[PDB]
């Protein structure tokens, strides 16, 4: 009977950054996905791998909710098989991804006049991320062929650039809160089911 705490996922007052995206494992509950698509609040809603109609009828073993924040223009990279600063160093979606990605604009809650620079994003890395690989390393990356002994210099930068979220910015540079639902189906009895299955 106990439903899945999706309210503890979208409505959360504090979201984490994308380089340190948060994950809340969802299991042993009842899915009510009708709440999701019966709403005009979500800007980008794209279900990958699942049916556009069997949403409330499916039954998966476990469900993973990956929630983070990126700006208006970096949501196109939250998709299977994409190339981008977020889709290479922050959040890598596999090509066989099976789940629904949810995104909406939050330019009034995560932004403020004068500046709200609490959110960060990984700008540099010597290798593209693997799927589901969370990277929170804090070592000074080296860009050029000149070694770096940690000094913040010409080609040695702190690998986390802050997000400048002000209300008077372009549409592409506004905070968009993203929730990625990953449907895990293993060789085991399901735990997250719908109401009409």
């Amino acid at each position, epitope marked *: 009977t106990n439903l899945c705490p999706f309210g503890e996922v979208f409505n959360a007052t504090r979201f984490a950054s994308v380089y340190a995206w948060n994950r809340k494992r969802i299991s042993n509950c009842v899915a009510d996905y009708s709440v999701l698509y019966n709403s005009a609040s979500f800007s980008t809603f794209k279900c990958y791998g699942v049916s556009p109609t069997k949403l409330n009828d499916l039954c998966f073993t476990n469900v993973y909710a990956d929630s983070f924040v990126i700006r208006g223009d970096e949501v196109r990279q939250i998709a299977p098989g994409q*190339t*981008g600063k977020i889709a290479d160093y922050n959040y890598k979606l596999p090509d066989d991804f099976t789940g629904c990605v949810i995104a909406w604009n939050s330019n009034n809650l995560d932004s403020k006049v004068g*500046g709200n*620079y609490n959110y960060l994003y990984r*700008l540099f890395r010597k290798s593209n991320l693997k799927p589901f690989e969370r990277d929170i390393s804090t070592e000074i990356y080296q860009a*050029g062929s000149t070694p770096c002994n940690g000094v913040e210099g*010409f080609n040695c930068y702190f690998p986390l650039q802050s997000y400048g979220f002000q209300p008077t*910015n372009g549409v592409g540079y506004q905070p968009y809160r993203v929730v990625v639902l990953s449907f895990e189906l293993l060789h085991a009895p399901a735990t997250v089911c719908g109401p009409g299955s």
Partner: antibody, heavy 127, light 107 residues
């Protein structure tokens, strides 16, 4: 809306000094970085130097390191480019543009970079 | 320091589909920019970081950002569109531009 009006370029023999100006208007100037980029007559664009949001990060390009220094007055919403030891080659039209994507420069990534709004053809004429 | 390549000297009739490919040099560049420069006027930022054009452009331009090779697609060519098109990289601070592409509508 926003206009990066420039004035201060003229004709001056090689070896002298002449600074340029980049007067901002509209948007908050103490929040965005500022570039300087020139284009020779008939040639293409060529980067010169840049300034952070007054964070003491110049990072000038080559052939001008020590000859050009970038100055900004965020309380006056203006931007300067002091020029000394005129290489006669430096005759070009200089453009100043904003920036909001740089890494050790302007705090936070806001908007794109190099929204040009440039003018002020600066000729480094001979004797 | 890169030396960005670009095929210049284009020619296409009114209302066509052209493309310009800016392949980068060493240290593969991420998120180039696309500008247009009509004669006698300062350049203008057309597209954002390898995609996602700004507000004001007539939405006839596009691009794709994939590592070392980039493209710049122009659909539905216009008589008031003859200019010079550059591509600029920003991952190392010595920013370098392209070669510029002169456009002339076939009449």
């Amino acid at each position: 809306e926003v206009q990066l009006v420039e004035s201060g370029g003229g004709v001056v023999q090689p070896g002298r000094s002449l600074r340029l100006s980049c007067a901002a208007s509209g948007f908050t100037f103490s929040s965005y970085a500022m570039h300087w980029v020139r284009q020779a007559p008939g040639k293409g664009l060529e980067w010169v130097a840049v300034l952070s949001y007054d964070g003491s990060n110049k990072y000038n390009a080559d052939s001008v390191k020590g000859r050009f220094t970038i100055s900004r007055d965020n309380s006056k919403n203006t931007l300067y480019l002091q020029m000394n030891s005129l290489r006669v080659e430096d005759t070009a039209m200089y453009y100043c543009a904003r920036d909001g994507v740089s890494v050790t420069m302007v705090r936070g990534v806001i908007g794109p970079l190099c929204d040009y709004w440039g003018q002020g053809t600066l000729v480094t004429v001979s004797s | 320091i890169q030396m960005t390549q670009s095929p210049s000297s284009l020619s296409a009739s009114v209302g066509d589909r052209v493309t310009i490919t800016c392949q980068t040099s060493q240290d593969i560049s991420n998120y180039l920019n696309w500008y247009q420069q009509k004669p006698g006027k300062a350049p203008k930022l057309l597209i954002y970081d390898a995609s996602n054009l700004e507000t004001g452009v007539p939405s006839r331009f596009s691009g794709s950002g994939s590592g070392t090779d980039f493209t710049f697609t122009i659909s539905s060519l216009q008589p008031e569109d003859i200019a010079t098109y550059y591509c600029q990289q920003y991952d190392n601070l010595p920013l370098t531009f392209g070669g510029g592409t002169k456009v002339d509508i076939k009449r």
